[PDB]
Scaffold this active site. Sequence first.
Site, PDB file in Angstrom:
ATOM      1  N   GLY A 104       0.823  -1.193   0.000  1.00 26.85           N
ATOM      2  CA  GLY A 104       0.000   0.000   0.000  1.00 26.85           C
ATOM      3  C   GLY A 104       0.857   1.242   0.000  1.00 26.85           C
ATOM      4  O   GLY A 104       2.063   1.171   0.204  1.00 26.85           O
ATOM      5  N   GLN A 105       0.220   2.380  -0.242  1.00 30.40           N
ATOM      6  CA  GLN A 105       0.870   3.669  -0.120  1.00 30.40           C
ATOM      7  C   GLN A 105      -0.023   4.600   0.687  1.00 30.40           C
ATOM      8  O   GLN A 105      -1.232   4.687   0.435  1.00 30.40           O
ATOM      9  CB  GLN A 105       1.142   4.260  -1.500  1.00 30.40           C
ATOM     10  CG  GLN A 105       1.659   5.695  -1.483  1.00 30.40           C
ATOM     11  CD  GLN A 105       1.298   6.441  -2.747  1.00 30.40           C
ATOM     12  OE1 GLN A 105       1.632   6.006  -3.854  1.00 30.40           O
ATOM     13  NE2 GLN A 105       0.609   7.578  -2.595  1.00 30.40           N
ATOM     14  N   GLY A 106       0.572   5.258   1.681  1.00 27.98           N
ATOM     15  CA  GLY A 106      -0.121   6.278   2.453  1.00 27.98           C
ATOM     16  C   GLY A 106       0.330   7.662   2.019  1.00 27.98           C
ATOM     17  O   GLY A 106       1.037   7.814   1.019  1.00 27.98           O
ATOM     18  N   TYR A 118       2.404   9.589   3.470  1.00 27.45           N
ATOM     19  CA  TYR A 118       3.765   9.903   3.888  1.00 27.45           C
ATOM     20  C   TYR A 118       4.791   8.866   3.454  1.00 27.45           C
ATOM     21  O   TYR A 118       5.989   9.024   3.704  1.00 27.45           O
ATOM     22  CB  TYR A 118       3.801  10.140   5.408  1.00 27.45           C
ATOM     23  CG  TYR A 118       2.818  11.203   5.846  1.00 27.45           C
ATOM     24  CD1 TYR A 118       2.894  12.496   5.324  1.00 27.45           C
ATOM     25  CD2 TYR A 118       1.804  10.920   6.765  1.00 27.45           C
ATOM     26  CE1 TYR A 118       1.996  13.479   5.704  1.00 27.45           C
ATOM     27  CE2 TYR A 118       0.897  11.912   7.165  1.00 27.45           C
ATOM     28  CZ  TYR A 118       1.004  13.184   6.624  1.00 27.45           C
ATOM     29  OH  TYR A 118       0.128  14.183   6.986  1.00 27.45           O
ATOM     30  N   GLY A 119       4.324   7.814   2.787  1.00 26.05           N
ATOM     31  CA  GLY A 119       5.226   6.778   2.304  1.00 26.05           C
ATOM     32  C   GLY A 119       4.507   5.494   1.973  1.00 26.05           C
ATOM     33  O   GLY A 119       3.285   5.422   2.051  1.00 26.05           O
ATOM     34  N   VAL A 174       3.824   1.225   2.434  1.00 28.03           N
ATOM     35  CA  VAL A 174       3.817   0.114   3.370  1.00 28.03           C
ATOM     36  C   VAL A 174       4.390  -1.090   2.600  1.00 28.03           C
ATOM     37  O   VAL A 174       3.887  -1.443   1.524  1.00 28.03           O
ATOM     38  CB  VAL A 174       2.380  -0.171   3.906  1.00 28.03           C
ATOM     39  CG1 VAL A 174       2.373  -1.382   4.824  1.00 28.03           C
ATOM     40  CG2 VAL A 174       1.803   1.073   4.629  1.00 28.03           C
ATOM     41  N   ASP A 206     -13.312   6.627  13.789  1.00 27.97           N
ATOM     42  CA  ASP A 206     -13.203   6.488  12.333  1.00 27.97           C
ATOM     43  C   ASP A 206     -13.475   5.049  11.885  1.00 27.97           C
ATOM     44  O   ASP A 206     -12.701   4.452  11.126  1.00 27.97           O
ATOM     45  CB  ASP A 206     -11.828   6.985  11.881  1.00 27.97           C
ATOM     46  CG  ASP A 206     -11.770   7.309  10.401  1.00 27.97           C
ATOM     47  OD1 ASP A 206     -12.815   7.612   9.792  1.00 27.97           O
ATOM     48  OD2 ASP A 206     -10.651   7.269   9.862  1.00 27.97           O
TER      49      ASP A 206
END
Length: 319
Positions: free
Chosen positions: A22-24, A26-27, A29, A175
């Site tokens: 994955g990508q968030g 800030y960077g 995973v 959330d």
Amino acid sequence: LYFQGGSLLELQKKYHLKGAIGQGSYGVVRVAIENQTRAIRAIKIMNKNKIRQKDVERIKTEVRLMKKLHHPNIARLYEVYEDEQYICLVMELCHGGHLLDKLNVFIDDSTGKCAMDVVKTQICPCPECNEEAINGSIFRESLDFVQREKLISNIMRQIFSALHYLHNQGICHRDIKPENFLFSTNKSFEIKLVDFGLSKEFYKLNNGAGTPYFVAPEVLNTTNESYGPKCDAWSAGVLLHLLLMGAVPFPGVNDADTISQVLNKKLCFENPNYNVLSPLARDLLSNLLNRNVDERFDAMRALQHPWISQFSDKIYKMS
Ligand SMILES: Nc1ncnc2c1ncn2[C@@H]1O[C@H](COP(=O)(O)OP(=O)(O)NP(=O)(O)O)[C@@H](O)[C@H]1O
Ligand SMILES: [Mg+2]
Ligand SMILES: [Zn+2]
């Protein structure tokens, strides 16, 4: 943004880094193999410079909470590594993708009823997933009324198990939404809650939101943080409605429209459309999406409800 983590030099000695899962913001995973144990982990890499350029408090909170939590339906955070530029979080890896990656929920046009397909996802590049893919054979599996309710109930049992635990630890999640739950594998329906970015300890509420579809009306209608964890039970009800009906109960064209519907719409589960649900599902929904906070279920009451509990607490072994 200092987390008392180990050095990145230690990280690179301890773990073999593999492909992204994955990508968030800030960077990425990345899948990682622990060299000494062969355990397969997810390492979330976050760039501290990009963070600083608000989310700082949320990140310290998420890390501090996930580190201390121990529940089979919450992704574990094992270790933290950092330097001046990066935070690296070594966590439990979920191979199965997001809730709605694996579960395909839609309204079947010919019957007007919600339908569900289970999808075998192709998201994880880890050695285990690789091995199973190249040796095996694949798809989309359609579920009947009985299969859907059984599966959804099982999903909800896990969500409420996690929430009961969290609430008893004195944490409000804030959330609860499908994106924040990942399937542990393609081999089972075990789920894990993987995001605590908006979470807050009860004892800190009012010390000085969420995705609009899922946010409780009392949250939207409060100037500050004067609301309780039943906001999470409401969010879980919204998730349940989506899984059962194929759509959220407050489907605004934009956030403003959504917020108004959440605030204004009195749900009437005596609308004839809900005839498609079992009486128990209908009843659980009505008790989670109760605008009266005092009367709304908490996680415990949801767990005790027969839609969740009916195959438990048996005497004679009838299998
Ligand atoms: N423990 C995990 N196992 C497997 N995949 C993960 C895990 N944690 C995060 N991911 C994947 O990484 C992606 C990005 O993580 P996320 O926590 O969303 O970062 P973010 O910056 O908060 N992005 P968003 O939540 O969309 O604002 C998610 O969509 C997951 O699919
Ligand atoms: Mg996140
Ligand atoms: Zn995998």
